[PDB]
């Protein structure tokens, strides 16, 4: 696939409708507009597109110094208080329709790192956690796993270090 990172403020109308539909099909039907209070003008998105230009992946990045999903919707998933630092960004609404997750995560990590992030945190499906592990990034738990309405998830961290950057074929200079 090919990745596209959007971070110029409010999404163009045609992009929002497209992402909204994809997110509806993935998060609603599989697991048309799916959006919550964390979809704002400052929100950063990364979309994956196939050879036909159609969205086949998505991700949402948010600075932890601003309101985020883990912090106010799932605070009980954390062993400790929710992070609030320029060094930590939240990864949410992450999906790919493993060799497909890799590109999406790479674009996600590079963008966050270019923004000062040294770590990523977010509620993660344990099935996705395993794929993160298989890919080789330095992922580790921020809390104990739990099954929410049947789906086992866990607050997960991803360190943006040498290991992670290497596994995603990113510039080692990003730290």
Q: TL;DR?
A:
The chain is an alpha+beta fold. The chain is built from 5 helices and 8 strands, in the order βαββαβαβαβββα.
Structural commentary:
By secondary structure, this protein is α+β, with helices and mostly antiparallel strands. It has a single domain (1-175), classed as Gcn5-related N-acetyltransferase (GNAT) (Aminopeptidase, 3-Layer(aba) Sandwich). The chain has helices at 13-30, 69-73, 101-113, 126-135, 162-167; strands spanning 2-6, 44-49, 55-63, 88-96, 119-125, 139-141, 146-148, 151-159. Strands 1, 2, 3, 4, 5, 6, 7 and 8 form an 8-stranded mixed sheet that branches. A hairpin with a 2-residue loop joins strand 7 and strand 8 (151-159). It is globular.
What is the strand and helix layout of this fold?
Elements: E1 2-6, H1 13-30, E2 44-49, E3 55-63, H2 69-73, E4 88-96, H3 101-113, E5 119-125, H4 126-135, E6 139-141, E7 146-148, E8 151-159, H5 162-167
Pfam families: Autoind_synth (PF00765)
Protein name: Acyl-homoserine-lactone synthase
Keywords: Autoinducer synthesis, Plasmid, Quorum sensing, S-adenosyl-L-methionine, Transferase
């Amino acid at each position: 696939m090919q990745t596209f990172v959007h971070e110029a403020g409010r999404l163009p109308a045609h992009i929002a409708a497209e992402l909204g539909s994809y997110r509806y099909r993935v998060f609603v039907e599989q697991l048309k507009m799916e959006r919550d209070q964390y979809d704002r003008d400052d929100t950063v998105y990364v979309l994956g597109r196939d050879a036909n230009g159609e969205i086949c992946g998505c991700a949402r990045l948010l600075p932890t110094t601003r309101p985020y999903l883990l912090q106010e919707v799932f605070p009980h998933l954390l062993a400790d208080e929710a992070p609030r630092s320029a060094h930590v960004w939240e990864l949410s609404r992450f999906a790919a329709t493993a060799w497909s997750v890799r590109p999406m995560l790479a674009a996600a990590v590079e963008c966050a790192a270019r923004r000062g992030a040294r770590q990523l945190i977010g509620v993660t499906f344990c099935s996705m956690e395993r794929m993160f592990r298989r890919i080789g990034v330095h992922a580790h738990r921020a809390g104990a796993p739990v099954s929410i309405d049947g789906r086992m998830v866990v607050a997960c961290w991803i360190d943006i270090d040498a290991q992670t950057l290497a596994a995603l074929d990113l510039d080692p200079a990003l730290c």
